[PDB]
Amino acid sequence: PGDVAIIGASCRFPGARNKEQYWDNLLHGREGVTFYAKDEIEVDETLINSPAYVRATGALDGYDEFDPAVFGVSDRMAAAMTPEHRVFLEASWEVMEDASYDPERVRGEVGVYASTNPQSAALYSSPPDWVSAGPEVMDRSNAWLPDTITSNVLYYLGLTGEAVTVTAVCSGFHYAVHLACQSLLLGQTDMAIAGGVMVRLPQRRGYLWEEGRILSRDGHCRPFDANGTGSVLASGVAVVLLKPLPQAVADRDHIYATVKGTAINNNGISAMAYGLAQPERLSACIAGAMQAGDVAPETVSMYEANGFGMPITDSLEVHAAHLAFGKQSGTCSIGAVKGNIGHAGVVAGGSGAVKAAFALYHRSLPPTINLTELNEEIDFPRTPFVPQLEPAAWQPECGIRRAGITALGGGGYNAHLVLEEPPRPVEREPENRRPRIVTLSALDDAAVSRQRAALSSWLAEHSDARLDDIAYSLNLGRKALPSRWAAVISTRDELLEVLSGDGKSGRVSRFGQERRADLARFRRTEDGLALGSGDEMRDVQALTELAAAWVQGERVNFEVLHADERSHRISLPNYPFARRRFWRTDW
């Protein structure tokens, strides 16, 4: 009754600049950890020559890159913002795009719940000084405080709602999703942006190996392996857009998976060393999440573990999951994504949750890598869990696909969330052949051309995408920006041709160069221009003039254009951010 749908997703991880790259890497079992030479590391002069220094890390490509003009941010402010502020702000923009929701036109309350690492801000620059209360002081505070990582999203995306920032160490992503779902179930918001960000500073840096501790000795992470010595430190970002399941189905959204239940607790007085799971407290967390979503352990066929790669910590976590599943659970696939990318800190739980969501969406199970000798002490044949050594189709005897993801952190933080595969797709009516308007807008002309190239490339990969879904998503899911482009077409092949080249071969492009659009033809609505009659909305000349009026900069009511058909929102390419490098120069 309290299911929450994941209708948009955005992430960046070691070796992946977007979610499609991340899922493709997981499918092929790639390792995203980077190894450096001594001269490639320009910090830790005192440690670089130690025999225990491991020159390996999970780097985040473009951690210092940002496109402030798209957000209305000045260059001065972009350098003042911590890298976590910028990376999370850019991911929030992308997650609204992936769900095809224009924040300017969202009619409801949107909550932004995120988790961040305050240690990064303390290393990036000195904190704000509150000796005076001028507007330049407030700008500096909004650039540095972790409290405004979520607030700046509401402000710069044009949303209205509530913002909550939490700091929960290595359980950050799960705690954000947990609090977001409480906001939705109590009716405080209509949809929620939830995620976390982790940018380790210094970025290009190794670590010091110490025997018996969580950091790996060779730079490789080997979950559930007998020869595992730990993990690698990683950076990344992961954001999801959450919406109640009945509403997401009613609005014909694109659903990756649904959140059945979440649970949090703390080890408390029953404390362990770092990474060591206390069986009683962690199992209560795992069982509580399954109880919240009314799912029985017999129905959960995938378990995404924390999995540092240490024999003792991996053994305790598998034991805790066993206590929560019981004996009669059956069989379940177990894996740990940390073998692929390392320990991503605040967003470590996000890497597992995003992997499980895409696993449920594509009905595939990605492998766990760096596993050559199974840990005999765990005794997997005596447990419900089977290590996923190879990729495989997900066809459970249970009948339903459900996953559980666990996040462990320092300070005793525990968290577990349970996901279910998305609802079965409804039968679609055949697509009407009629002229449609498609729109693209960006900040400058060069970015619009990148959007056209990105859109044409996407069309080849997704040949089964309907045109009425494409136009509906582009027209109602993107912000209207100054440099604009539009076309009126009827088939997918016409769309591919007008996008090609300079993009000026379409009737709308030739219309705008010859004559200006006559607005007296249209009727004014509260949301913009509309056509005068229902018959006019199938006339090529009427639709061409309306699209040209939009290209000239007028506001068009796209809701009434698609009012007669029940199209679906689909996932389209993100904005092609021009990524200038920004870094503070004064401490």
Give residues in contact with K ion (CB under 5 A): 202-203, 265
State the nearest-atom distance from the C-beta of 315 to K ion, in Å: 24
Q: With binding defined as CB under 8 A, does residue 122 bind a second copy?
A: no
Q: With binding defined as CB under 8 A, does residue 201 bind a second copy?
A: yes
Q: Where are the beta strands (DSSP E) in 29-146?
A: 34-35, 53-54, 56-57, 65-66, 110-115
d(Cα 54, Cα 168) in Å, to the nearest integer? 27
Stretch near a second copy under the rule CB under 8 A, chosen from 47-55, 107-115, 390-398, 504-512: 47-55
State the nearest-atom distance from the C-beta of 231 to a second copy, in Å: 24
| Residue choice 20, 42, 294, 445 for contact with a second copy (CB under 8 A) | 42
Dmax of the chain from CA atoms? 79
State the nearest-atom distance from the C-beta of 124 to a second copy, in Å: 9
341 CB contacts (<8 Å, ≥6 apart)? Answer: 13, 14, 15, 32, 33, 58, 234, 236, 351
Q: With binding defined as CB under 8 A, does residue 51 bind a second copy?
A: no
Q: How far is CA 534 from CA 435, 473, 537, 538, 567, in A?
A: 14, 21, 5, 8, 18
Stretch near a second copy under the rule CB under 8 A, chosen from 87-95, 438-446, 474-482, 578-586: 578-586
Q: With binding defined as CB under 8 A, does residue 127 bind a second copy?
A: no
Nearer to a second copy, 45 or 429 (CB): 45
Instruction: Return the one option of K ion, a second copy, none that residue 274 interacts with (CB less than 5 to 8 A, by type).
Output: none
- Quote the tokens at residue 364: 């595939």
Residues binding a second copy: number (CB under 8 A): 26
DSSP bridge pairs for 9: 240
Nearer to a second copy, 136 or 376 (CB): 136
Helix (H) or strand (E) holding 488: strand 483-489
CB of 353 closer than 8 Å to CB of 238: yes
State the nearest-atom distance from the C-beta of 254 to a second copy, in Å: 40
d(Cα 486, Cα 468) in Å, to the nearest integer? 15
Pairing of strands 110-115, 161-166: parallel
State the nearest-atom distance from the C-beta of 34 to K ion, in Å: 14
- Quote the tokens at residue 379: 């005794």
Q: Which one, of 573, 575, 568, 574, lies nearest residue 473 by Cα?
A: 568
State the nearest-atom distance from the C-beta of 200 to K ion, in Å: 9
Q: With binding defined as CB under 8 A, does residue 585 bind a second copy?
A: yes
Instruction: Return the one option of a second copy, K ion, none that residue 140 interacts with (CB less than 5 to 8 A, by type).
Output: a second copy
Nearer to K ion, 237 or 438 (CB): 237
Nearer to a second copy, 74 or 188 (CB): 74
Instruction: Return the one option of a second copy, K ion, none that residue 271 interacts with (CB less than 5 to 8 A, by type).
Output: none
- Quote the tokens at residue 579: 């990524």
| Residue choice 1, 51, 134, 381 for contact with a second copy (CB under 8 A) | 134
| Residue choice 52, 123, 208, 446 for contact with a second copy (CB under 8 A) | 123
Q: With binding defined as CB under 8 A, does residue 76 bind a second copy?
A: yes
Helix (H) or strand (E) holding 88: helix 83-98
Q: With binding defined as CB under 8 A, does residue 586 bind a second copy?
A: yes
d(Cα 355, Cα 306) in Å, to the nearest integer? 13
Stretch near a second copy under the rule CB under 8 A, chosen from 4-12, 45-53, 269-277, 425-433: 45-53
Nearer to a second copy, 49 or 513 (CB): 49
State the nearest-atom distance from the C-beta of 26 to K ion, in Å: 27
| Residue choice 2, 18, 48, 182 for contact with a second copy (CB under 8 A) | 48
Say what the alpha-carbon torsion angle 120, 189, 566, 452 is, to the nearest 10 degrees.
-20
Tell how far CA 159 is from the center of its chain.
Answer: 18
Q: Which one, of 496, 485, 483, lies nearest residue 453 by Cα?
A: 496
430 CB contacts (<8 Å, ≥6 apart)? Answer: none
| Residue choice 268, 294, 504, 583 for contact with a second copy (CB under 8 A) | 583
Binding site for a second copy (CB under 8 A): 39, 42-43, 45-50, 76, 123, 128-129, 131-132, 134, 136-137, 139-140, 201-202, 583, 585-587
